[PDB]
Amino acid sequence: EIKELLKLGDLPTSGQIRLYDGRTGEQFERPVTVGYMYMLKLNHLVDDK
Amino acid sequence: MVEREEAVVWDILDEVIREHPVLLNRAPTLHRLGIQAFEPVLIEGKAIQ
Amino acid sequence: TEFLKPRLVDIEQVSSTHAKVTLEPLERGFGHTLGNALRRILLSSMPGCAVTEVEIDGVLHEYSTKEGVQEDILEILLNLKGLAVRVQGKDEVILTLNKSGIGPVTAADITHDGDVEIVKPQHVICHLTDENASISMRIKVQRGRGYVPASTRIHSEEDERPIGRLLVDACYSPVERIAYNVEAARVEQRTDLDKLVIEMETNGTIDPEEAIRRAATILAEQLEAFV
Amino acid sequence: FLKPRLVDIEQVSSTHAKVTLEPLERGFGHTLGNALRRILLSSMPGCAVTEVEIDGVLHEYSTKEGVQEDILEILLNLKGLAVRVQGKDEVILTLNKSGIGPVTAADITHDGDVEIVKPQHVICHLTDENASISMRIKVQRGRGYVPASTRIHSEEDERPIGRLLVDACYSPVERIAYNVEAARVEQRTDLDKLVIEMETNGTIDPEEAIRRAATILAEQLEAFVDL
Amino acid sequence: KPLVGTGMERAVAVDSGVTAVAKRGGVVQYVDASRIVIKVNEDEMYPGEAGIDIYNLTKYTRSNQNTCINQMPCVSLGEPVERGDVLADGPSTDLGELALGQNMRVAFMPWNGYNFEDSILVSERVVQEDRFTTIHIQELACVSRDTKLGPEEITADIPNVGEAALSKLDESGIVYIGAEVTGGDILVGKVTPKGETQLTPEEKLLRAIFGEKASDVKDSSLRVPNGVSGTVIDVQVFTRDGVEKDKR
Amino acid sequence: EPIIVPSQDVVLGLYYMTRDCVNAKGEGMVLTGPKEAERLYRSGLASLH
Amino acid sequence: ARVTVQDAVEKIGNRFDLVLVAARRARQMQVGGKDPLVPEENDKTTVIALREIEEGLINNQILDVRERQEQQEQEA
């Protein structure tokens, strides 16, 4: 079902695109792991350190 | 002068930083391998690089 | 809006090895826009001179034998690619090496044309051992821009089907090492601006400072449409 | 050493367009296209609201008695407004809206220099009819992300604490991709054609920007020509 | 809110008490920010003094962690609701739905030491949009009104300063309604008497002439905590049990 | 022993550097110096293995 | 900058007594008692003393000589 949705989107079946460095512009050989994940910031702040 | 952080005193700060040895010791340090010495580099931040 | 101008450049120099440019100040990603730029340009877009072809005469192979040589024809080829040469008002030129006897075959025994100037005549091409050693080669040096490997260039005349020429990698790069570095520059009350430090080396067909102004003109050239 | 040249800036939409450069040489268009990218993301004179002194607001941690949204939110929606200036770098406006309705960005004291890209951008939501919210919006021009944080150090003693500031992000540009490919001309093996696919917020014109940004590269070539 | 959750998002909102829920359905009539006036549908409208409900939202306050909590109005004007829907948003909630953080385009590639095992690398776009920022509204207690040494008054007699400090200390000597206090300024004025043993004979005589309280009451106010630069939003005052304050 | 052993990130860096395979652009040519070898891969006219 | 101090070990390799000696020399440099002889490269006195010992021009031998030399200069 997962691969089916990457196909149901204009996204790569793999989910690994070959990127171009913002500090270079070359292909990171062997498509790299890319996509969204839900982040979560903790309540640990540097002003309390 | 340092009350207003005059750019002047920062150059004087430079003079007392260029080749001034510094000692770095962590807290969770139980063994002597947590104590070394370094050289300063002016960093615009909050954490010790 | 207010812009800032690049100034203070430390030309740290050591004879012919390296010059290290220290320029201040830079901003958020300016040590990159500058560094990366020079690198690709000094690699596949920089004019220079180097050997493209080397017809010995009889033996057109690298793994054979030539009586009177302590090296192998292979080692000979490597030194040919590393020979520092520079012409002025000529594109392609072929020279001749006529050496005999026991001794280091330096870059001085070749025929010096009115444009072909070996910057390092001391550069020993091949080592020639004992007695006879009748070696004579026909070398082709050419002007180009960048680096032409023989891997991508499979010559359409005497290498597609025949032999009669050898295929080396013409090094048209007047440099040797491109290592740019980013390090925090510091404006008094201000924040961490950057300082581009460029460890750059050149062979001898050009010296550090000349090379800097050179590509500078070519940058204005490729920025001529707007700036 | 053929000079470079662009073609008509293909305007597909008002927000994003694409330029195309035919006269490129091997390598240049690649590293220079990356070098331009950084420039077209840094040295760009953007416009950002800095000081907004609101009617019944002493601090952004309050809500105007008559609005649906929160003052903090409204300030972020002010950063959501794309505005252009032509003569002066700075201008103070005054929002005057009263009546139940999504407050569009065209009810402000409209100066001839102030230029909204889309007067339909709702800043706040009025839910009452007897509430006439007014607010002087001091917007100016600069480049790169310049936050009110780094600017409150001088402060100039801002005693009038009805004046609530906001972070000035001066960046018109958005998403920059460059499409390098074989440039097909009949007199050459293959050149390079840089199809700069760009996204903007809609404030500064692309051509204005690229000649202006190339002039900033000219500034950044000054000392590179100087030895 | 997490795009790919498990379906308990609204379930957090409904089983928690961070979002103001409705106990009856109906068209909202007057929604501002701190108030949400509701008109209830007759099918479930009480035959007891009609039925217009109200929901009061906490607007930018503090917590245990001294972090900000604000019930954000999710319902606009002229929009009906159901007996079991939301009106506000507690902290870290989107339409009631549990919205802790935010999801971004995460990648996994080694790239110039900014990712050594624990080291994380993030785009400056986050703080350039200010999507991940918190508000720390802090509470600091103040004491006054009679210390056995002498009945205390708020501000009243304030020495050791000029009038520059009083630019935000009104006709009560108390801090403004939204000031930018920094470094080491004073929040509220606090006065306290001094001492017998310390008064000199050359100031015992001058003391019994230039008034009843010449060099007795000093300035020992509650000052802005050393090392903080924020903004005073709300003042929680407690008048003397029986006798009012003065004006503020 | 020189206590500091490349942990993980730096190890993989040099691991993808010195490594051998069978298929690689340019596999077979000759260079008279590792210096031009530097200017050979930074450009990318041959594979790293 | 200074990569190692192994060259100091080549001359005076006590690793600790080194600290003592050169430190006192740096203090005569502070108090106007004296001044250096080996030009500093923005290096404050600590690093300057390091250079002096690695070359081996001003070691414990010479420092004690300086001590007794000052004794003839203060006495007479």
Q: What is the rounded distance in angstroms from the CA atom of residue C62 to the CA atom of residue E44?
A: 98
The structure tokens listed for E21 are 């829920």
User: Cβ of D35 and C39 within 8 Å?
Assistant: no
**What separation, in Å, do the N-terminal and C-terminal C-alpha atoms of chain D show?**
24
**Does residue E61 sit in helix, strand or coil?**
strand
- Residue E192 buriedness (CB in 10 A; 0-12 / 13-18 / 19+): middle
User: Cβ of G46 and B39 within 8 Å?
Assistant: no
List the Cα angle D137/D140/D143 in 5-degree steps.
140
Q: What is the rounded distance in angstroms from the CA atom of residue B21 to the CA atom of residue B19?
A: 6
Instruction: Tell me which method was used to determine the 3D structure.
Output: cryo-EM
Cβ atoms of residues D87 and D100 within 8 Å = no
Q: How far is CA C114 from CA C48, C117, C207, D94, E86, in A?
A: 17, 8, 21, 77, 90
Residue whose entry in the numeric block shows the structure tokens 């100091």: G8
Resolution of the solved structure (Å): 6.7
Q: What are phi and psi of D179, to 5 degrees?
A: -100, 95
Q: How remote is the C-alpha of E81 from its chain's centroid? A: 30
Rg (alpha carbons) of chain A, rounded to whole number: 17
Nearest C-alpha neighbor of E153 from the set E139, E168, E171, E173: E173
List the Cα angle A9/A10/A16 in 5-degree steps.
100
Dmax over CA atoms of chain G, in Å, equals 45
Q: What is the rounded distance in angstroms from the CA atom of residue D38 to the CA atom of residue G66?
A: 60
List the Cα angle C197/C198/C200 in 5-degree steps.
155
Closest residue in F to C40 (Cα) is F43
Q: What is the rounded distance in angstroms from the CA atom of residue G75 to the CA atom of residue C88?
A: 75
Cβ atoms of residues C52 and C93 within 8 Å = no
Chosen for mutation from B14, B15, B17, B19 (greatest number of chain G CBs closer than 10 Å) is B19
Q: What is the 3-state secondary structure (H, E, C) of chain C?
A: CCCCCCEEEEEEEECCCEEEEEEEEECCCHHHHHHHHHHHHHHHCCEEEEEEEEECCCCCCCCCCCCCCCCCHHHHHHHHHCCCEECCCCCEEEEEEEECCCEEEECCCECCCCCCEECCCCCEEEEECCCCCCEEEEEEEEEEEEEECCCCCCCCCCCCCCCCCCECCEEECCEEEEEEEEEEEECCCCCEEEEEEEEEEECCCCCHHHHHHHHHHHHHHCCCCCC
Output the DSSP codes for E9-35. Answer: HHHHHHHSSSS-B-SS-EEEEEE-SSE
Q: What is the rounded distance in angstroms from the CA atom of residue D168 to the CA atom of residue D165?
A: 9
| D2-29 exposure pattern, b = at least 16 Cβ within 10 A, e = fewer | eebebeeeeeeeeebbbbbbbbbbebbb
User: Cβ of F33 and C79 within 8 Å?
Assistant: no
Enclosing H/E stretch for D133: strand D133-146
Pairs across C and F, CB distance < 8 A: 60
CA atoms within 13 A of residue D198's CA, in its CB half-sphere: 29
What residues of C are in contact with residue F31 (Cβ under 8 Å)?
A: 78, 81, 169
Closest residue in G to B14 (Cα) is G42
Q: What is the rounded distance in angstroms from the CA atom of residue B39 to the CA atom of residue C33?
A: 29
Query: C25 preceded by cis ω (within 30°)?
Result: yes
User: Cβ of C184 and B42 within 8 Å?
Assistant: yes
List CB contacts of B49: < 8 A, sequence separation 6 or more. B41, B43
What residues of C are in contact with residue D141 (Cβ under 8 Å)?
A: 1
Beta bridge partners of E97: E94
Cβ atoms of residues D159 and E167 within 8 Å = yes
- Residue C31 buriedness (CB in 10 A; 0-12 / 13-18 / 19+): buried
List CB contacts of D22: < 8 A, sequence separation 6 or more. D5, D7, D183, D185, D191, D193
Q: What is the rounded distance in angstroms from the CA atom of residue D52 to the CA atom of residue D64?
A: 14
Q: What is the rounded distance in angstroms from the CA atom of residue B42 to the CA atom of residue B47?
A: 12
Residue whose entry in the numeric block shows the structure tokens 């690709």: C40
E84: left (phi over 0), alpha (psi -120 to 50) or beta: left
Q: How far is CA C60 from CA C57, C73, C164, C165, in A?
A: 7, 9, 6, 6
Q: What is the rounded distance in angstroms from the CA atom of residue C45 to the CA atom of residue C144?
A: 9
User: Cβ of F8 and E116 within 8 Å?
Assistant: yes
**What separation, in Å, do the N-terminal and C-terminal C-alpha atoms of chain E show?**
43
Closest residue in B to G47 (Cα) is B19
Q: How many CB atoms lie within 10 A of CB C181?
A: 13
Helices and strands (DSSP H and E) totals, chain A = 1, 2
